[PDB]
Amino acid sequence: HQGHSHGHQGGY
Amino acid sequence: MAAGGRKENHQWYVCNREKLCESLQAVFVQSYLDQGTQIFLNNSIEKSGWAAIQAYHSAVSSAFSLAMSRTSINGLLGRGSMFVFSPDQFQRLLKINPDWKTHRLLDLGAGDGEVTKIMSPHFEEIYATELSETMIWQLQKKKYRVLGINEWQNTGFQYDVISCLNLLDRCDQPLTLLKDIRSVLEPTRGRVILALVLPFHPYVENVGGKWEKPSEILEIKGQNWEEQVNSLPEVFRKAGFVIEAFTRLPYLCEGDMYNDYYVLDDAVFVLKPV
Ligand SMILES: Nc1ncnc2c1ncn2[C@@H]1O[C@H](CSCC[C@H](N)C(=O)O)[C@@H](O)[C@H]1O
């Protein structure tokens, strides 16, 4: 599993 | 878009305009799920249905993830390309016509160039920077001139558009980067195209899933998309820029074995020097 090429996103 | 229009993914494009500061309300540009976005999406869905390709990519990524960045694996295989804007969205945001052309583009941290290529027809010469070896090869196959990361500031010429898409949250020195950009942008007519994933969460990609915190802090702060955008005028001012226009756009990415594509939330700005 590679997901989004930009990386994982956090929260506000 | 219509409040009852199905499959328009409103959440990708709308914001609560009253939550924006007044000066940002005046320059917000509404974007929509347009033809070029759908082509990228339909292309990605097709790709994700090529099971033998996905399985190969996933086996290579598994075997070599300890020795190479994710970005370099993607460039090695030619996979996981991304999408920020269509040519129409880019032109509507810059306020140029389909045939508008100028001299020099510089795309910093251009990745594999599939976002750069949306902008390329508007320029006679295209330059780019990139830290990934395999991505540099992808940029060179597209015939872009790849400059060193301390080379572009010292070429003896200026750039008519500098694009800095989704790099500020991935580079070690974002504030030095913004200031370098201002110092070599053509001042009478040059513009900067900037894209940032919100919520702002920066780090520097290394090998093996490892990562580091950047050594410079961008002062981006807020509890939702609108508040974080609201902190950006002052960040850009420190670097000598005012926002000329901006929009909300889905930061799309080709998919894998588990999802047809991936989405992040981009804020996209046109900056003019001040
Ligand atoms: N200091 C730096 N100079 C040039 N590229 C950098 C960099 N720090 C990180 N990068 C590169 O920046 C990229 C961020 S991914 C963003 C890619 C593309 N601009 C897009 O919007 O889709 C990665 O390819 C990474 O290798």
The domain limits of chain B are 27-273
Q: Count of H helices and E strands in chain B?
A: 10, 10
**Is the CB of residue B241 less than 8 Å from the CB of residue B64?**
no
- Give the whole-angstrom CA distance, residue B125 versus residue B145: 8
What backbone phi and psi angles, to 5 degrees, belong to B124? -80, -35
Burial class (CB in 10 A: 0-12, 13-18, 19+), B238: middle
The shortest CB-CB distance from B61 to any of A2, A4, A9 is to A2
Question: B166: which 2 tokens?
Answer: 């989704």
- Give the whole-angstrom CA distance, residue A8 versus residue B155: 35
Residue B119's SS3 state is: helix
Rg (CA), chain A: 8
**Is the CB of residue B115 less than 8 Å from the CB of residue B93?**
no
What is the CATH code for B27-273?
3.40.50.150
Beta bridge partners of B107: B128, B163
Name the residue at shortest CA distance from atom 12 of ligand 1.
Answer: B109
Residue B114 beta carbon below 6 angstroms from any ligand 1 atom: no
- Give the whole-angstrom CA distance, residue B24 versus residue B5: 27
- Give the whole-angstrom CA distance, residue B190 versus residue B96: 13
The shortest CB-CB distance from B224 to any of A6, A7, A12 is to A12
Residue B106 beta carbon below 6 angstroms from any ligand 1 atom: no
Q: What was the experiment behind these coordinates? A: X-ray
Residues in chain A: 12
Residue B261's SS3 state is: strand
The shortest CB-CB distance from A6 to any of B79, B253, B258 is to B253
Residue B6's SS3 state is: coil
Resolution (A): 2.1
From B24, B13, B15, select the one nearest B234 (Cα to Cα): B24
Is residue B144 marked as binding? Answer: no
Question: B213: which 2 tokens?
Answer: 């915190």
Is residue B166 marked as binding? Answer: yes
Is residue B186 marked as binding? Answer: no
Residue B163 beta carbon below 6 angstroms from any ligand 1 atom: no
Instruction: Specify the amino acid at residue B272.
Output: K
- Give the whole-angstrom CA distance, residue B121 versus residue B159: 15
CA dihedral B58, B214, B81, B181 (to 10 degrees): -160
The residue with tokens 């990605």 is B44
The residue with tokens 């670097």 is B239
Residue B111 beta carbon below 6 angstroms from any ligand 1 atom: yes
Q: Look at B199 and A3 and tell me if their CB atoms are within 8 Å.
A: no
Q: Residues of A numbered 1-12 whose beta carbons fall under 8 angstroms of chain B's beta carbons: which are they? A: 1-7, 9-12
C-alpha B166 to ligand 1 mean position (Å): 7
Q: Which atom of ligand 1 is nearest to the CA of B170?
A: 9
**Contacts for B221 with CB less than 8 Å, ≥ 6 apart:** B227, B228, B231
Beta bridge partners of B252: B83, B263
